[PDB]
Design a protein around this ligand. Structure first.
Ligand SMILES: O=C(NC[C@@H]1CN[C@H](C(=O)N2CCSC2)C1)c1cscn1
Lengths: 730, 730
């Protein structure tokens, strides 16, 4: 009869396993097993050693990661990894010659590379270093410099500046090899007019004077970085000292004022797709460009333009969805909101057609989460259609030739244990691995695409299961409540022997930012686990307005006015939970991180009287302090000509007074490059001026994730005691 | 039966009055009465209006202060005051013509003056603006620019750079008019090689990007600013476009390496005294310089050199004491430690004499606090000699011609109420005002110097007294305990009906920096008042080793090793208090501000087990982070060639572990330009790495004094609750 200890969480006592494979072909994949890369044969367990427990140790214990060239002839060995922002980081590299069996040592790769990648074909390498792009046709050969305009915090070649890396593309990379690797496309950003933010860094206690880190960061309404798209011909490098890249200029309907680059997608080797967005993400354009062999130039005829629009708010969830072209690249499928505001898959022809550019292949009050593969006859995708559970994930598949031959492939499998799947099809969809994150313990299995025959079970968490036997684990209810005639899902982490008759303290867990989803059918062992399994606290989350994958009516509901409906609904939801009986109204709390810290703060400061205390970690306190791309997408510009009013109305500090009725815990990281601390500094200052006592805690040199080992443990222990004091436990 | 509420303290319910006069002659003074400057006649209450409730309101309600020219013909009206560091500040000025009865409006004075002052004679004005000195022979006349090398944060002309303003001279000023105002001496500092510290400033919540303030600040061992001394002839300004100042170069025995300027003192109009100090304040020189009429140059013959030394530690308390010359300037009296290490008054002759430069006029196990006046026959001073109370203050006087004719002038007056006096003699010591801060309510009275006849009582706090009647005020015990055979004074703020038999919680109040004194006979209404009068907590302070005015044996005891004996003795003292019975050993705490925050932290981290909790406000965590002038004076240089070891041993973070046995509250100001926050940031980080939970609180944009109105209230309310939680009260 043991409970899930806070130490069980902090020291990761119970490990949850998974099967992360790397498809090498349409029939084999790679897998890391005891620091040995093994090549497996989907169909038969047939394995084989690809790289040894060995190799990886020459570069000591700093071997961060590995990347095998597509022709399996070489392997990139990453080491001396150094983080920088959410996705950026620099490392050192070594090419290992599989065949020659040894580390290539001649034309080595710079000891501080910002980014590197193989081509999609052979062993071509493109890497950014010192903000400049370099190409190596083959591992042993010398490095060819592609750009030279590169300059720290000013000119970025092939990598994204801070805001792009964070808000547009999900990563640091701004490179794109064409299939067959003839061309190499890339973006270049000029951060010149972009203002700087400058926080202090204290480093070791031996540093006598703290450093100052500055970052070109555009806050709402500020001058944004600029872009340019280039494509350089890789096949000529050996015959010149310098090659001249060809530039593609964004479509006219976007160039009049500020704008951004949305997505890059190679159709074939003479056709590329680029998506552009206006600073006011009300409008989006996806041009298709063809390579003219004669005049050696790329053309993007308005005839192949394609426009995406939104009268309710903005485009896509975070950005227009990505196109998926056919082989002959004559058509493509893309996820776009239909007439009812539901994100669904529809067809397009390279050439736009007057208000009929689309033809939906999907309908319903549910949404297609993402397209996973496009066979010459089938379209594999993932949706939350099944059982009308917006919080569930299932793998479907439609026959192109017959849009009726639509079939779910994971719905049956384990309806009890699995309702939240992740997929991964082989190079040509011959096999597909399933990742069950579903209610129960994560279950990984691979199947033969043809008939779905489950070849074998890659990973069932029997080990984890065996251990969780001797522990009083809490349960998780995933249902919905109905407000103003609409379903709104929520989830509750119920403490062990949960008796519906008794009264328990409630803790609302929040985020609730645009298009977010806190209520889902995925298994997790987090802090809330400990909170219910040992403190008997009910941890609940509620996806209200401006959220998830339930149509734009619900998501766009927040448009032009953050800090409104999503906050309110969070309070309503608490009301409902109370009316559900088992909640001790005298002990209701609410905490949130990032955007969640904002809502938590806005809720505590609403004077609704429904909450006793709360904790906001690295919250946003007013939208002018947050970056441009994100904020403006939901708020527009902070100008009297636009939405200045809603900007100034949604301030946390403007609700300082109402905090007198609450125990508040404000936590923030000193080196938070995302939500600047300036944000919390402005909150504390507002409460101090209001004469409201509260509790604060800064984390020296910590990120926006306060994720360093010692800090991570410290912050959760601290919040634990805060709740214990607040809930009269401890 | 009402107690002294925390609100009584925060809202300053009970005002303590005083009589701050401004001697205008040897027989009249100025006094602000209901916003009216009144001229009084010492001898007879005879008054008279000098400036009206009026005048002061033309400049609205921003009239910060006033300064009357010595010939009482004009008045400087200060307004638009803006703080900057401990003593620096900028303001706007207006000269009011008393005679012509109106504000001079012609050659006005710059709207951002950094410093201004009248001559000692007529109506000459010298002011610094934009780091340059300017002179105006008369209020109506045009401004003459004296320097032009001035440049922000680089070259300071007539004002001190940060470290000088804070650690050497007690103010912003670096100007010195000669008597008769012929010459104007000044210092010039070059902050060129001095490193910068850069903290953030968030300002109003409307500022989208926080500012960055940088200050040339030398931390221990860093490159210090440089100096130069000049004297310019004021009488020529009208006959030139530019005058050429004459430079005095520091004495050779100081120029070999880094050094500072200690004090400037005009002897007569052709003789000036300058004191210099080596970077290692082991040595000090006071040259006397004469003006050569022929070659128009100042000479500082080594024959008039005068050397001050210390084999135990450093010179003076914070700096060599100031000289007090006779009329004919043939001799001077200065406070210097005698053979036994006791700060006493002794005579000097302009010319140095081989190891006999002095002749003491005072002896004993007590010290002369300060010299107050030097008549042609009498020397008025202040000491803690009486009743052998190092924490008491009394005004004495010695006859020059007969050093036996020594007499105390305040010892009798009110032995019960007054034991801590402040003085203020008229221009030629004909009258002297006494300021009783003594145990009881502050009592101000003026006396006729001749026979001491108390002419009248300027201010007795009858009003305050009448109000404190209906309140249960706590008492104050000022005694001493004896350790290792030596007296060590302490003081206790005992809660109201204090019953020696019961047990009360104890709170140690600390500072204990070199030459400090927390145990004295002065009346006060602070936080500790509320803490005893309403929380029944015993607030006690203990002046241990490295302190007060009890000889260098006690003060220099800490030399080259801060964070040692002064910490220990603070713990010993608590032991003693416990042995005194009336202390609930299960509830002993300790808090301190600034240096006190350091000791508090060092004590809590000593694992002595004697303290339950504590609060450190803007503490120092390791001496390398603190400025040079101060640190090095007691620690030397942080180099292996000197005292690097004691620097690294006295770290607060090196005692992180021991904090697991204590409830700790760390508080710090965001814009602390003195003790950088970097200091607390390094502490929190150390505890986080050690896995020690604790409590923190930052004050946005607050100073080292966290003295803004709202912050001041907030911080004390917060500390109050922290003690209440810790002491199980509240
Ligand atoms: O007031 C004087 N010295 C006292 C020193 C001036 N600044 C030091 C300070 O601010 N500390 C804060 C943390 S520990 C030290 C104390 C002083 C006046 S004239 C020469 N010295």
């Amino acid at each position: 009869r043991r409970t899930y200890t806070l130490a069980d969480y902090l020291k990761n006592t119970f490990r949850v396993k998974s099967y992360s494979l790397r498809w090498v072909s349409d029939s084999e994949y790679l897998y890391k097993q005891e620091n040995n890369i093994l090549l497996f044969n989907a169909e038969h367990g047939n394995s084989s050693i690809f790289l040894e427990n060995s190799t990886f140790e020459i570069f000591g214990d700093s071997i961060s990661d590995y990347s095998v060239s597509p022709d399996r002839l070489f392997v990139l060995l990453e080491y001396n990894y150094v983080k920088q922002w959410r996705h950026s980081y620099t490392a050192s590299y070594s090419i290992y010659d599989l065949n020659k069996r040894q580390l290539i040592t001649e034309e080595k790769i710079p000891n501080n590379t910002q980014w590197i990648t193989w081509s999609q074909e052979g062993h071509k390498l493109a890497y950014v270093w010192k903000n400049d792009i370099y190409v190596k046709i083959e591992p042993h050969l010398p490095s060819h410099r592609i750009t030279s305009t590169g300059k720290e915090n000013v000119i970025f070649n092939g990598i994204n500046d801070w805001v792009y890396e964070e808000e547009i593309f999900g990563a640091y990379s701004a490179l794109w090899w064409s299939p067959n690797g003839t061309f190499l496309a890339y973006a270049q950003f000029n951060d010149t007019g972009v203002p700087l933010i400058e926080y202090s860094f204290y480093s070791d206690e031996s540093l006598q004077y703290p450093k100052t880190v500055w970052i070109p960061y555009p806050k709402a309404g500020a001058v944004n970085p600029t872009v340019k798209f280039f494509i350089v011909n890789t096949d000529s490098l050996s015959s010149t000292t310098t090659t001249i890249p060809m530039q593609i200029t964004a479509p006219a309907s976007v160039t009049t004022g500020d704008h951004y680059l949305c997505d890059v997608a190679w159709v074939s080797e003479d056709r590329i797709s680029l998506q552009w967005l206006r600073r006011i993400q009300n409008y989006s354009v996806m041009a298709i460009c063809d390579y003219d062999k004669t005049t050696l130039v790329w053309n993007c005829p308005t005839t192949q333009e394609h426009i995406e629009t939104s009268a309710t708010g903005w485009c896509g969830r975070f950005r227009p969805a990505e196109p998926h072209f056919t082989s002959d690249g004559s058509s493509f499928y893309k996820i776009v909101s239909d007439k009812d505001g539901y994100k669904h898959i529809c067809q397009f022809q390279k050439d736009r057609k007057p208000e009929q550019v689309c033809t939906f292949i999907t309908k319903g009050a549910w949404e297609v989460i993402s397209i996973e593969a496009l066979t010459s006859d089938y379209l594999y995708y993932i949706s939350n259609e099944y059982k009308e559970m917006p919080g569930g994930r299932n793998l479907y598949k439609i026959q192109l030739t017959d849009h009726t031959n639509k079939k779910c492939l994971s719905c049956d499998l384990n309806p009890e244990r699995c309702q939240y799947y992740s997929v991964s099809l082989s190079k040509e969809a011959k096999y597909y691995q399933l990742g069950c994150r579903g209610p129960g313990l994560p279950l990984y299995t691979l199947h033969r695409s043809t008939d779905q025959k489950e070849l074998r079970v890659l990973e069932d968490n029997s080990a984890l299961d065996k251990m969780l036997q001797d522990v009083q684990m809490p349960s998780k209810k995933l249902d919905f409540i109905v407000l103003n005639e609409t379903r709104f899902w929520y989830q509750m982490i119920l403490p062990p022997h949960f008796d519906k008759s008794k009264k328990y303290p409630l803790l609302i867990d929040v985020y609730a930012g645009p298009c977010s989803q806190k209520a889902d059918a995925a298994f997790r062992l987090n802090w809330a686990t400990y909170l219910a399994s040992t403190e008997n606290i009910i941890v609940a989350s509620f996806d209200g307005r401006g959220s998830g994958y339930q149509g734009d009516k619900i998501m766009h509901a927040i448009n032009k006015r953050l800090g409104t409906l999503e906050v309110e609904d969070q309070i309503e939801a608490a009301r409902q939970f109370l009316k559900m009986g088992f909640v001790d109204s005298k002990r209701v709390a609410i905490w949130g991180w990032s955007y969640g810290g904002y809502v938590t703060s806005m809720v505590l400061g609403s004077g609704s009287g429904v909450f006793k205390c709360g904790i906001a970690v690295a919250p946003v306190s007013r939208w002018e302090y947050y970056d441009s791309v994100y904020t403006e997408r939901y708020m527009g510009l902070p100008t009297p000509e636009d939405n200045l009013d809603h900007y100034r109305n949604s301030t946390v500090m403007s609700r300082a007074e109402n905090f007198k009725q609450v125990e508040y815990l404000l936590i923030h990281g000193t080196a938070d490059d995302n939500v600047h601390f300036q944000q919390s500094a402005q909150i504390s200052k507002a409460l101090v001026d209001a004469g409201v006592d509260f509790q604060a805690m800064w984390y020296t040199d910590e990120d926006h994730g306060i994720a360093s080992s010692t800090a991570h443990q410290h912050i959760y222990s601290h919040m634990s005691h805060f709740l214990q004091q607040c809930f009269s436990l401890r």
